[PDB]
Amino acid sequence: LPGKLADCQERDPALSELYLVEGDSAGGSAKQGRNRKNQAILPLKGKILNV
DNA sequence: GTACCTACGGCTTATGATTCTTCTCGCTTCCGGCGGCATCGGGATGCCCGCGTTGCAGGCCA
């Protein structure tokens, strides 16, 4: 929960949005240019192992 | 693709210590009430006489 996740002010689901981008390259400007009402961004690190 | 360490210098803020404010234990002993009796100075009551109080009308003041 800490570290990377930055939720919005609203807590009721089906109203907010979630995004998945590169952390240090994209998430910075994404948070600096997003809204603080119904916006949430979850950064990522590199790739993800296959299933 | 990403994280964690200290030196170079200054103000502050996050917590254990010391002088100033205060809360009130101890009773006991010199001292302060407390009551009774002889004493003394004041005054209320009475009479006399002149002065303090008040009403009228005028000139001065806030």
Swiss-Prot record:
Changing D24N: In nal-24, nal-102, nal-103, nal-107, nal-108, nal-111, nal-114, en-2 and en-5 mutants; resistant to nalidixic acid and to enoxacin. It is found in: Cytoplasm. It comes from the Bacteria. Mg(2+) 1 binds at E22. Changing E22 to A/Q: Strongly reduced DNA supercoiling and relaxation activity. Reduces ATP hydrolysis in response to DNA binding, but has only minor effect on the basal rate of ATP hydrolysis. The record marks K47, N50 as: Interaction with DNA. DNA gyrase negatively supercoils closed circular double-stranded DNA in an ATP-dependent manner to maintain chromosomes in an underwound state. This makes better substrates for topoisomerase 4 (ParC and ParE) which is the main enzyme that unlinks newly replicated chromosomes in E.coli. Gyrase catalyzes the interconversion of other topological isomers of double-stranded DNA rings, including catenanes. Relaxes negatively supercoiled DNA in an ATP-independent manner. Heterotetramer, composed of two GyrA and two GyrB chains. In the heterotetramer, GyrA contains the active site tyrosine that forms a transient covalent intermediate with the DNA, while GyrB binds cofactors and catalyzes ATP hydrolysis. Belongs to the type II topoisomerase family. This is DNA gyrase subunit B. It comes from Escherichia coli (strain K12). The lineage of its organism: Bacteria, Pseudomonadati, Pseudomonadota, Gammaproteobacteria, Enterobacterales. The gene is gyrB. The chain holds residues 403 to 453 of 804 of the full protein.
